Amino acid sequence: KAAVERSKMIDRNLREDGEKAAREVKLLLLGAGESGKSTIVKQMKIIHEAGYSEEECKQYKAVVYSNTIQSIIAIIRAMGRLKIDFGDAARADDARQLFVLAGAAEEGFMTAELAGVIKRLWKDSGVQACFNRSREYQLNDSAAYYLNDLDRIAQPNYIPTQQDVLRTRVKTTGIVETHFTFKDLHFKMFDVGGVTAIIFCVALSDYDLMNRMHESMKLFDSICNNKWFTDTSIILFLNKKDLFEEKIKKSPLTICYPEYAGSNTYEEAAAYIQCQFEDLNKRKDTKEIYTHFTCATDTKNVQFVFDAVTDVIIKNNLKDCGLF
Ligand SMILES: Nc1nc2c(ncn2[C@@H]2O[C@H](COP(=O)(O)OP(=O)(O)O)[C@@H](O)[C@H]2O)c(=O)[nH]1
Ligand SMILES: [Mg+2]
Structure with missing residues (x-):
C-alpha cells in the first residue's frame, strides 16, 4: 500500500529530469539524555551504509x-x-x-x-x-x-x-546531522544533542531510579502537543526494553507509578507505560502516536522498526516531502 501511495504522486513530472531528483525526509531525534538517540544514529550507518x-x-x-x-x-x-x-x-x-x-x-x-x-x-x-x-x-x-x-x-x-x-x-554535544538513503528516500537525520517526522526515545529502564520517567513524560507532553509539529508524524520509541525486561522481574512499577495496580509483569507494566505516554496527546482525534518497543543496540530490531516507521512516513507525509 506504501508503494501504491508513492505511485500516485505526479510532481517529478514537473522537473526536467524528475526521475533523478531526490525526495527528502527531515527526521528529528528527541528524548532525554541517555535514552538511546545516538545509538539509533549508529544503527542507521550500520543498516543503510557500511556502518563500522x-x-x-x-x-x-x-x-x-x-x-x-x-x-x-x-x-x-x-x-x-x-x-x-x-x-x-x-x-x-x-x-x-x-x-x-x-x-x-x-x-x-x-x-x-x-x-x-x-x-x-x-x-x-x-x-x-x-x-x-x-x-x-x-x-x-x-x-x-x-x-x-x-x-x-x-x-x-x-x-x-x-x-x-x-x-x-x-x-553528544552540539547538533549532529546524518544523511542516508532508504527506499529511495533521502533522510536528513538530526540528533539534537547538547520536520517530516520525530522519533522520541524513552529509556524504559529509568523507571525505578523529579522522577526520571516523569521528566521524560513532561518533555514528550510539550513536544507532542506543539503546534509546529501539527503535521509531523510523532514516533515514540519505548527503548531499553531488554533492560526493562530484566528489571521488572524484581523491581515494581509502583516505584515510578504509585497508583499502578496491575501485575508487575513485563506485559502489564510495559502496556501501562505506553498508555501513560500516549494519553498526553491533547488531540487524540486529530493526531496519532506511533509507538514501538525497541532495543536500540539490537541491529535486527531497529531495522524492523525503522522499516515500519518509513511506511508510516510514506503513507502520512510524502506530499510534504520536497524534491531536490
Ligand atoms: N541494553 C541497552 N542499552 C542501550 C539501549 N539503547 C541504548 N543503550 C545504551 O545506553 C547508553 C546511552 O545511549 P545513547 O545512544 O548514548 O543515548 P543519548 O544520550 O540519548 O544519545 C549507551 O551506552 C548505549 O549503548 C537499549 O535498548 N538496550
Ligand atoms: Mg547522544
Whole structure:
C-alpha cells in the first residue's frame, strides 16, 4: 500500500529530469539524555551504509576501556556509601589497586594486571550484591555487558566488535546531522544533542531510579502537543526494553507509578507505560502516536522498526516531502 501511495504522486513530472531528483525526509531525534538517540544514529550507518569497519571500530577501543573502568569504579565506590562488604576480604586490596592503576593514567587502558584486578572484583559476591542495587546510584547501562566479557576485551590484540561500539557511552554535544538513503528516500537525520517526522526515545529502564520517567513524560507532553509539529508524524520509541525486561522481574512499577495496580509483569507494566505516554496527546482525534518497543543496540530490531516507521512516513507525509 506504501508503494501504491508513492505511485500516485505526479510532481517529478514537473522537473526536467524528475526521475533523478531526490525526495527528502527531515527526521528529528528527541528524548532525554541517555535514552538511546545516538545509538539509533549508529544503527542507521550500520543498516543503510557500511556502518563500522574494523578500522573504525579500532578507534573506539580506549572508549570501551574507559567505560569499563568507570563502571567498576562506580560499583566499588557505591559499596562504601551503601555499606556493603567484600564477599572475600582479600578483594579490598584489589579495590585499592584499581584506584592505583586508574589514578596513574589519563585515558582508558587495559593491562593483564588491570584485567586481573577487575575480574576478581566483579566475581565477588559483595560486589555482585552492590551491582544488583544499581538503582540506588549512577552506573553505566553497559556495565554488565563489558564486565562479563572482560576476558575477550582484555586480550592484547583486541579489536572492538560492532556491538562493542553500539554499547559505548559517548556524550553528544552540539547538533549532529546524518544523511542516508532508504527506499529511495533521502533522510536528513538530526540528533539534537547538547520536520517530516520525530522519533522520541524513552529509556524504559529509568523507571525505578523529579522522577526520571516523569521528566521524560513532561518533555514528550510539550513536544507532542506543539503546534509546529501539527503535521509531523510523532514516533515514540519505548527503548531499553531488554533492560526493562530484566528489571521488572524484581523491581515494581509502583516505584515510578504509585497508583499502578496491575501485575508487575513485563506485559502489564510495559502496556501501562505506553498508555501513560500516549494519553498526553491533547488531540487524540486529530493526531496519532506511533509507538514501538525497541532495543536500540539490537541491529535486527531497529531495522524492523525503522522499516515500519518509513511506511508510516510514506503513507502520512510524502506530499510534504520536497524534491531536490
Ligand atoms: N541494553 C541497552 N542499552 C542501550 C539501549 N539503547 C541504548 N543503550 C545504551 O545506553 C547508553 C546511552 O545511549 P545513547 O545512544 O548514548 O543515548 P543519548 O544520550 O540519548 O544519545 C549507551 O551506552 C548505549 O549503548 C537499549 O535498548 N538496550
Ligand atoms: Mg547522544
